[PDB]
Structure 1
Amino acid sequence: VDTCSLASPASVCRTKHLHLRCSVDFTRRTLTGTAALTVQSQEDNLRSLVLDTKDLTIEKVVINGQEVKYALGERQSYKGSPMEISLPIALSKNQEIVIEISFETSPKSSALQWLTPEQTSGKEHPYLFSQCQAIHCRAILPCQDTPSVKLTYTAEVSVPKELVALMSAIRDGETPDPEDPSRKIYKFIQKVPIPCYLIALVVGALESRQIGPRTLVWSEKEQVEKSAYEFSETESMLKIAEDLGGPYVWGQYDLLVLPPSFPYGGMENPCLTFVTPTLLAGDKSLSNVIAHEISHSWTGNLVTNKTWDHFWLNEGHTVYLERHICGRLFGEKFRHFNALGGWGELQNSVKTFGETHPFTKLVVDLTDIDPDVAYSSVPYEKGFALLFYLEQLLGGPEIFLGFLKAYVEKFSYKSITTDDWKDFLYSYFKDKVDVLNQVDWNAWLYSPGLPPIKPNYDMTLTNACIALSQRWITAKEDDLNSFNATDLKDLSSHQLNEFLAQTLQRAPLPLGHIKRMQEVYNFNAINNSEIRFRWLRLCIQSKWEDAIPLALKMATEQGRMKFTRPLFKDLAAFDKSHDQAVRTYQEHKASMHPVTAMLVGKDLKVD
């Protein structure tokens, strides 16, 4: 039972294939076309079925060349409206039919962001991008919008000829549009069965540069060169991931660097990972996001969560693999450093939500909950902590990686629950069941708050961050002169970020301390988005008025939710910037990504 979907479940019927034929209309801000769904009946005498839709305009439904009856139910908030389709003939079990739905998206589709030329790098062309995870595919096309159903797809997308279209699929050619010479049709093929949240589309003035044997980086021309350098470790990370998870089955691994309003750090769209331009630090320091997206090619894209209640399966295992890739490239001491950092991020999420909050549970119950509202570090970090705890309990990383590879092999091309995962863990580790029976499963999986046990972490790389953070926290006015730029000479950008995170956990600090920190460290000059984000939060929470224009600029010049949401919340909580935070949000609301706009609105209590 997928409580986030209004469609017929996989026990009734299953979509096997989607053939999408659409046109991108920038003037109307609509995608117009036909979604031809190959549906297989799982029941005898099947006469109707239900699909998910959200703000879609349906023109007609054609089956076997004839128009059929359909009805749209009442809208159920963020779940959208169920579409019931009357089949022209009753279907036997395993019988297939093609249902061709003519539709148009709304300009306010929650899956899409339409950008005017002014909102892009080049300033001459418009731009469009999609983001389906978790339940926004229904706001693009009618579908069984549930990760419990996997389908292949083909697509033909008509766009203005001066633009390029890309999808989460293999590029299958381009031709002039035979119905409009001012347009081009780009073709796509996704031969590997995927859940529909993995369907993705981008249309804009895109250029590409090859960075590996199976990787192109795509972006507007202005970002191509910086992107090619930033993500140069991609091929080496793909090779390590294959060693850990088995063959890469997707063919190509391309990267698309989106405009700054992209709401997430990355999105694992198959064949075409989408990334935030906030990774463009100039030193490859934020490349763990690429390692994370690459890992999803196994954990999430091959083995998928059956419902959103089991999303931790996707994230926990991906973070676990991501940390091993970075560990193979930079050492085991670095893997422990990132892991311990992740525990800190989990402490933060638990503190923010509250230790009894249901969203702090590993397995959640999303009935009547908008998944976008539940989104946090919890499934990532509590999921990772569980796996890291199990690794230590079970004999170490080599042993636990053996389980991960077998797990991916066992469940490839399937959608699974937490019970399916636990059963296989027990089956794989049959000779260690007595060890497994010591795990407090009810607490780990179903209880809110911090996990019952904290794993063991090597402290080598963390020690200098903790030492410097503690020097600042315990410093009195007569100690401020003892700080100097030399305090940072032996710290990597990762350690600098960790020093800020540690200090931020004890914020506010006195205003004189924060002013001294700028004087000696010149943190205002740092472009690295992670570091700048934590430094600006530290300044605002410490009531430094000078930081207000810097924090407002970062919150609005980019839209990665991880940065924009806490920056707006900190600015709203500071009396000196409260009014400016609310006004800036209201002024930018129309230009923002629809999900980000909704979430920042809720955070600020501005309707």
Structure 2
Amino acid sequence: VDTCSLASPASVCRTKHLHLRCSVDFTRRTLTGTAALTVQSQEDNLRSLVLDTKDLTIEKVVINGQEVKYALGERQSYKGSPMEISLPIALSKNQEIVIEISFETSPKSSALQWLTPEQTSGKEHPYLFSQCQAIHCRAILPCQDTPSVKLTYTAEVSVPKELVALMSAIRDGETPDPEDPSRKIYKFIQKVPIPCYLIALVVGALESRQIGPRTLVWSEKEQVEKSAYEFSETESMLKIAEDLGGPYVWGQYDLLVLPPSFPYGGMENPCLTFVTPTLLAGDKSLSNVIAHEISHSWTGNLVTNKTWDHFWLNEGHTVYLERHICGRLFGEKFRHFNALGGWGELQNSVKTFGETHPFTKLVVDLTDIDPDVAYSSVPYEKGFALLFYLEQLLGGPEIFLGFLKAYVEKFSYKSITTDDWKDFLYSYFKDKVDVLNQVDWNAWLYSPGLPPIKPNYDMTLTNACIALSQRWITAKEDDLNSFNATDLKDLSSHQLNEFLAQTLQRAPLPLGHIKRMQEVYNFNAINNSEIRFRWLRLCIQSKWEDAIPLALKMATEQGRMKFTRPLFKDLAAFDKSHDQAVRTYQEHKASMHPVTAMLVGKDLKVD
């Protein structure tokens, strides 16, 4: 049972298919139409069922041509309102019916952000995009909003004819809208069963450019050129992933580069990965986010977490798989560099939450907690650490990659728990039980804090970052003169990023140090979003007032939560910036993504 869903669970009935027909109305900021769910009974004498909804207006519910009775429960906060539907005939086990629900979303749907023309690149057209993971699909349409159920889907989306709709599906044609010649209808088919958190929709002035045999990059016109460059490794990454995980089953792999307020680095919507434009560094150095999303086509989209309590299964294995893709592209020493960095990030999260915090457990209990509130690097990096540890315990990456491929084949098209994974692990490594049985499973899976064992990391590419960081940390005033732009000559962009992360762990530094750093390195001029984020955190935590406008601007000119939340928090913790941070949030909040608006408010202890 899925503590985050209010719907009938899979033991009662399962949605097999969705046919969505909707119209996007930028005036009223609503999606309007019909969600026809083919539902299979899993019980004898099934007479009613419950769906998830969130701020939906239900117009009617039709089964075999007739309106049927339904009622909406009391809103249960971020869970929304359960909707009980009375079936007109009782269903036997395995019997399937179609339930046609007419509905309209609210302008305040937590799944959606509606952008005015001035919020887009082009300035002439508005824009809409969705983000359903974890539990926002219910705010677009009535569903069993739980990853324990997988369905296929078809859709027809009516939009102003000057715009383009895309979804997490194969494009199946466009036509003028028969009802309305100022409109176009775009068609979509997803033949592979998916959890409903993978439903996605974007509408805007989108253009496309081919960048691989099964990849087009979509964006507003202003970003297409840089995007085609930035993500040019996509096909080579997909070929590697296929080698590691088995056949890519989804057909197309397109990319969509969103406007700056998209809340996440990437989202692995099937057939159409959504990415932040803050990936656009000019040198492909942030493309590991693409390798990550690619990897979810196996770990998460094919084999899926049964409830959000088991999110690590999705994220940890994806980080594991993407670090392999990076290692295949650039070398094992690079794989180690990224893994060791990911340990640093785990250390950071644990210090931030605190070493006893229940959300520092690998497997968590989400009863009564908004998954967006509890979201952090933990399931990613503690998840990965477990896997990298097991890799080294069981005889190395080649051996563990056989397990990973077999694990994907075994649970393709299914939704599973941590016990399913662990059971299969023991099964595959039957001949190595004695080694597995030395693992402290209770602490790894269920204890808070850092894991009980640290894996072994190659240091080769990290040493230079550490050395330059330790020079700055151990420097006194009369050593500042010895730093010079030549210090960076031999560092890659990743190493620069890792130098900054090492240094930021020891923040604050003295203000004269941070001043000298800008004097000699000009970090203010770097466009790399990761590097600039860490440089700006270091400056604010080290109380440099000059950085305040830069950090405010970065927090607001884009909205990827990974950057926007810590920057607003740092700025709120700095007495010289506190009020301006609060007021800037208060000024921007109407125009932010609803989820990011919400969390930034909590983080700032405002309203």
Q: CA deviation at 1:173?
A: 0.6
Q: 2 CA distance for matches of 1:255 and 1:363?
A: 31
Aligned equivalent of 2:571: 571
1:123 counterpart SS class: coil
Deviation of 1:482 (Å): 0.5
SS in 1 for 2:460: coil
SS at match of 2:52: strand
Q: Distance in 2 between matches of 1:41 and 1:105?
A: 27
Q: Does residue 1:395 correspond to 2:395, yes or no?
A: yes
Q: Deviations over 1:415-458 (max 9, x none)?
A: 00000000000000000000000000000000000000000000
In the TM superposition, residue 136 of structure 1 has moved relative to its aligned partner by 0.1
C-alpha deviation, 1:92, in angstroms: 0.3
Deviation at 1:534, TM superposition (A): 0.2
Q: Secondary structure at the match of 2:83?
A: strand
- Structure 2 counterparts to residues 107-146 of structure 1, below 5 A: 107-146=107-146
Give 3-state SS (helix, strand or coil) of 2:316's partner. Answer: helix
Alignment of 1:450-461 (within 5 A): 450-461=450-461
- Counterpart CA distance in 1 for 2:494 and 2:16 is 44
Structure 1 residue 559, shift from structure 2 partner: 0.2
Deviation at 1:604, TM superposition (A): 0.2
Gaps of 5+ in 2: none
SS in 2 for 1:512: helix
1:266 Cα shift?
0.1
Kindly provide the CA deviation profile for residues 257-296 of structure 1, in whole angstroms up to 9, marking residues without a partner as x. 0000000000000000000000000000000000000000
Distance 2:594 2:158 in 1: 24
1:586 aligned partner? 586
Deviation at 1:316, TM superposition (A): 0.3
Deviation at 1:41, TM superposition (A): 0.2
Instruction: Report the alpha carbon displacement of residue 342 of structure 1 after superposing the two structures with TM.
Output: 0.1
Query: Separation in 2 of the partners of 1:75 and 1:211?
Result: 45
The CA RMSD over aligned residues, in Å, is 0.3
Counterpart-to-counterpart distance in 2, 1:370 and 1:185: 35
For residues 491 and 212 of structure 1, the distance between their equivalents in structure 2, rounded to whole angstroms, comes to 30
Structure 1 distance, partners of 2:175, 2:468, is: 60
Cα shift readout 1:559-581 (whole Å, capped 9, x = no counterpart)? 00000000000000000000000
Instruction: Tell me the alpha carbon deviations over residues 529-582 of structure 1, each in whole angstroms, 9 at most, x when there is no partner.
Output: 000000000000000000000000000000000000000000000000000000
User: What's the TM-score, normalizing by structure 1?
Assistant: 1.00
Cα offsets for 1:238-260 (capped at 9, x unmatched) = 00000000000000000000000
Q: Which residue of 2 aligns with 1:320?
A: 320
Structure 1 residue matching 2:339: 3-state secondary structure? helix
Q: Does the alignment pair 1:606 with 2:600?
A: no
**CA–CA distance in structure 1, aligned partners of residues 435 and 265 of structure 2:** 37
How many Å separate the matches in 2 of 1:539 and 1:2?
43
* Shift of residue 4, structure 1, vs aligned partner: 0.1
The 4+ residue runs of structure 1 with deviation greater than 2 A are none
1:21 offset after TM fit, Å?
0.3
- The offset of 1:461, in angstroms, is 0.4
1:485-529 Cα shifts (integer Å, max 9, x gaps): 001000000000000000000000000000000000000000000
User: Alpha-carbon deviation of 1:116?
Assistant: 0.4
Residue 90 of structure 1 deviates from its aligned partner by 0.2
C-alpha offsets along residues 458-488 of structure 1, whole Å, 9 cap, x if unaligned?
A: 0000000000100000100010001000010
Deviation, structure 1 residue 396: 0.2
What is the CA distance between 1:144 and its match in structure 2?
Answer: 0.1
Partners of 2:332 and 2:272 lie apart in 1 by 29
1:410 deviates by 0.1
Distance 2:461 2:569 in 1: 31
* Residues 1:105 and 2:78 aligned together: no
Equivalent residue for 1:166? 166
Q: Say which SS state the counterpart of residue 40 (structure 2) adopts.
A: strand
Q: Secondary structure at the match of 1:81?
A: coil
| Partner Cα distance (2:573, 2:347) in 1 | 21
SS in 2 for 1:531: helix
Q: Map 1:96-495 to 2 at 5 A.
A: 96-495=96-495
Q: Deviations over 1:356-382 (max 9, x none)?
A: 000000000000000000100000000
CA distance in 2 between partners of 1:368 and 1:489 (Å): 51
Residues 45-98 of structure 1, C-alpha deviations (whole Å, 9 max, x = no match) = 000000000000000000000000000000000000000000000000000000
Deviation at 1:222, TM superposition (A): 0.3
Return the alpha-carbon distance in structure 2 between the equivalents of residues 227 and 486 of structure 1: 31
Separation in 1, partners of 2:118, 2:475: 47
Q: Structure 1 residue 104: deviation in Å?
A: 0.2
Work out the CA distance in 1 between the residues paired with 2:78 and 2:160.
31
Q: Give the superposition deviation at 1:25.
A: 0.3
Residue-by-residue CA offset, 1:99-142 (whole Å, 9 max, x unaligned): 00000000000000000001000000000000000000000000
Find the aligned partners of 2:113 and 2:483 in 1 and give their Cα distance.
Answer: 46
Deviations 1:292-335 (A, max 9, x none): 00000000000000000000000000000000000000000000
> What do residues 379-401 of structure 1 show as CA deviations (whole Å, max 9, x unaligned)?
00000000000000000000000
Q: Distance in 1 between matches of 2:575 and 2:450?
A: 32
Deviation, 1:602, is 0.3
Name structure 1 gaps, 5 residues minimum.
none
- Return the alpha-carbon distance in structure 1 between the equivalents of residues 501 and 266 of structure 2: 21
Matched residues, percent identical? Answer: 100
Corresponding residue SS for 2:129: strand
Query: How many angstroms does 1:583 deviate by?
Result: 0.2
User: CA offset at residue 402 of structure 1?
Assistant: 0.2
Report what 1:532 is aligned to: 532
- Taking the aligned partners of 2:369 and 2:394, their CA distance within structure 1 comes to 36
Secondary structure of the 2:364 match is coil
Question: Scaled by the length of structure 2, what TM-score is found?
Answer: 1.00
In structure 2, distance between residues paired with 1:488 and 1:92:
70
The structural deviation recorded for 1:14 is: 0.1
Shift of 1:20: 0.1
Q: How many angstroms apart in 2 are the aligned matches of 1:561 and 1:363?
A: 23
- For residues 565 and 126 of structure 2, the distance between their equivalents in structure 1, rounded to whole angstroms, comes to 26
Q: SS where residue 53 of structure 1 aligns?
A: coil
Distance in 2, Cα, partners of 1:280 & 1:471: 31
1:251, 1:479 → 2: CA distance? 58
Q: Distance in 2 between matches of 1:603 and 1:343?
A: 25
2: distance between equivalents of 1:253 and 1:212? 9
CA offset at residue 195 of structure 1?
0.1
The separation in 1 between residues aligned to 2:253 and 2:602, in whole angstroms, is 36
